[PDB]
Structure 1
Amino acid sequence: TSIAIGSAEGFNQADKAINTAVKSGRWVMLKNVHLAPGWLMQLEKKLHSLQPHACFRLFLTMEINPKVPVNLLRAGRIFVFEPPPGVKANMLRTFSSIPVSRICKSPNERARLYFLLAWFHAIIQERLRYAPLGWSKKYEFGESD
């Protein structure tokens, strides 16, 4: 159950989804939780006093933002998503993201094209690390492109 945070209906939906998933063991994801720090504090307090199902998982997608409470940061496990460190890591992540079947279709040239695309991506994104020289500004060349 994926829920975007920011509206009162969103808070009610998140509460209901968590209440049903702690029992059923299903997964709940809440996006952009950094837009409600007080609700984040009360969410951490609610999460502390629970004994959910063994398969229950709550994901909190957020942006690195100092308004995020530190009690939530300590309660949960943090994974930082950022540009890959280099060209090789960028290409590895690109090849991991694309399914194997999608690259390996009936046209045998497709794979090479994909590789070229990956390389091109891995180039331009890395040039973002050199702000004035790589480009004129920090463009958001990302996974959507």
Structure 2
Amino acid sequence: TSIAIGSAEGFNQADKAINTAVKSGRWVMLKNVHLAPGWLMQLEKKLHSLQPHACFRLFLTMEINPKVPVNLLRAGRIFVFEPPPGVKANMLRTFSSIPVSRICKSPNERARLYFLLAWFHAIIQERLRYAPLGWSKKYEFGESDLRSACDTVDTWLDDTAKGRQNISPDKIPWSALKTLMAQSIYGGRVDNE
């Protein structure tokens, strides 16, 4: 049960979902909980005096914000999500996120296209670290851009390759992918010539 924090009915839904899941053993995720620190303190106090089901899990997804209560941080286990340390780590994360069955489809060139996409994403995200030289500003090149690029690659490869096992590299729609990534997927965030 996924609930986005921020509204009073959102708090009611969160309370009801937690009360149901601590008995049924289902998972409850609450997003952007950093926007309600007082309700976070109340939630920590509620969680301390509780004996939930063995399979119950409560995920609280937030941004790193000093307003998050300290007692909640001590009560839970913290996982920090941030850009991967390097190109190799970025490519490993990309290859882990993308399902194997998606890459290993009918065209044998899809694997190489996905590898090139992963390398491009890793290079761009690593260039983001050097803010004035790698880019001009800290662009939000993230997972959404990678997913959109993968969807575009899949769409245009299935369009060009009508279920064939192999497609000649000359026939791959390079212009389509390049233009859509430069103008729509990655170039949409770019506001600099």
TM-score by length of 2: 0.75
Distance 2:49 2:104 in 1: 48
Alpha-carbon offset, residue 60 of structure 1: 0.1
Alpha-carbon offset, residue 119 of structure 1: 0.0
Distance 1:52 1:35 in 2: 25
Instruction: Give the aligned length.
Output: 145
Between the two structures, name the one with larger relative contact order (CA 8 Å, sep ≥ 6): 1
Alpha-carbon offset, residue 90 of structure 1: 0.0
After superposition, the C-alpha distances for 1:18-38 in whole angstroms (9 at most, x for unaligned) are: 000000000000000000000
Flag structure 2 segments of 5+ consecutive residues without an equivalent. Answer: 146-193
Distance 2:78 2:114 in 1: 32
Q: What stretches of structure 1 move > 3 A for 4+ residues in a row?
A: none
After superposition, the C-alpha distances for 1:2-44 in whole angstroms (9 at most, x for unaligned) are: 0000000000000000000000000000000000000000000
Alpha-carbon offset, residue 97 of structure 1: 0.1
The 5 A counterparts of 1:2-81 are 2-81=2-81
SS in 1 for 2:144: coil
Give the percent of matched residue pairs that are identical in Structure 1 and Structure 2. 100
Alpha-carbon offset, residue 75 of structure 1: 0.0
Distance 1:124 1:89 in 2: 13
1:107 aligns with 2:107: yes
TM-score by length of 1: 1.00
Q: Please identify the structure whose Cα radius of gyration is greater.
A: 2
